[PDB]
Ligand binder design. Structure first.
Ligand code: NI
Length: 341
């Protein structure tokens, strides 16, 4: 049964609610982004209207085989009427195709659902600037002050410089990047660009990348692994055993691997600066954990909410424990007392 924090009051609408069967009273199912915890339940047998971005709709059609007649893609930054209710989709600064949804209720209430997002000051000059928001359904993944991490730009600077140094010292090194979902494509695209290489990957991953409207993508990726010195592999294979095995496969074209695991936050963030990050090494294999996040840090979250000044906050992440919920409620009250709303 569908939890309350997935229902939009005063509408027939749900958000990211595909794993509960037919939801009573739902006339339109919104999908914020193509991550498995959010799409869980969709397939070619789904026959209700799905509302989403163009990119998300490309992935629904090609990867999950949802029939075309039930996919309703909306343009971003554009007032649209869905089942008699004005909505707007906004870029969430998460993975490709990810949106926040603004709902203008018939009674005058305005609701923002962030989906998953990485708050940014650029959001303070979207269509959010133009009116008041009563209720915020908030991605609270990293809602605690211990969650610090660098900008995406500093992380990519570290990765490009690390990869370029290693391959210039040893032209026979291979770079490997881990993946298990869409998102974080800048990691492997930026490294391949500095090296003058395409990114090599499986046919299934190539298929997924081809749904993403990334400009000049045919120039950047390939299924011909052997022509490429940046390879993508499943995240599970980014360990010394998995990488040793991969190095066998290239037929002694390569004699060293440098591998990247973009994680979110890890507690090496509470002690180490990005500048100071070092790999784990075994023989001719090194593995770097790099803190590339597509969710808000605590400080970014706090700045967004203190700017928006919502009347009520409904968390959408970490809601399963009383300790989590109490911690998050305490920070919401601090923010409101400090800013004066
Ligand atoms: Ni996500």
């Amino acid at each position: 049964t569908c939890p309350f924090y997935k229902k939009i009051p005063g509408t027939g609408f749900t958000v990211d609610a595909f794993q509960y069967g037919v939801v009573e009273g739902c006339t339109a199912y919104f999908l914020t982004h193509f991550h498995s915890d959010h799409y869980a339940g969709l397939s070619k047998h789904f026959t209700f209207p799905v509302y989403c971005s163009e990119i998300t709709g490309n992935l629904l059609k090609n990867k999950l085989h949802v029939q075309e007649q039930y996919i309703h893609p909306l343009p971003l930054d554009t007032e649209c009427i869905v089942n008699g209710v004005k909505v707007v989709l906004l870029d969430a600064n998460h993975c490709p195709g990810a949106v926040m949804i603004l709902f203008y209720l018939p009674n005058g209430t305005v609701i923002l659902h962030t989906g998953d997002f990485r708050a940014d000051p650029s959001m303070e000059r979207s269509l959010l600037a133009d009116q008041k928001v009563h209720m915020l359904y908030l991605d609270t993944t990293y809602c605690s002050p211990e969650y610090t991490f660098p900008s995406q730009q500093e992380v990519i600077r570290f990765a490009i410089n690390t990869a370029f140094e290693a391959v210039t010292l040893n032209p026979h090194a291979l770079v490997v990047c881990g993946t298990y979902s869409i998102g974080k494509e800048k990691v492997f695209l930026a490294i391949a660009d500095v090296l003058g290489s395409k990114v090599g990957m499986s046919q299934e991953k190539y298929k997924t990348l081809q749904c993403l409207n990334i400009p000049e993508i045919n120039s950047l990726i390939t299924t011909d692994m052997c022509s490429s010195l940046v390879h993508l592999l499943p995240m599970m294979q980014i360990n010394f055993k998995g990488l040793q095995s991969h190095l066998k496969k290239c037929g002694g074209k390569y004699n060293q691997i440098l591998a990247f695991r973009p994680t979110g936050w890890t507690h090496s963030n509470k002690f180490t600066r990005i500048a100071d990050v070092i790999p784990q090494t075994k023989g001719n294999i090194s593995i770097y954990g790099i803190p590339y996040s597509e969710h808000s840090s605590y400080l970014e979250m706090k700045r967004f909410v203190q700017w928006l000044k919502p009347q009520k906050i409904i968390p959408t992440v970490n809601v399963g424990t009383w300790k989590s919920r109490s911690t998050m409620e305490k920070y919401f009250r601090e923010w409101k007392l400090e800013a004066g709303y």
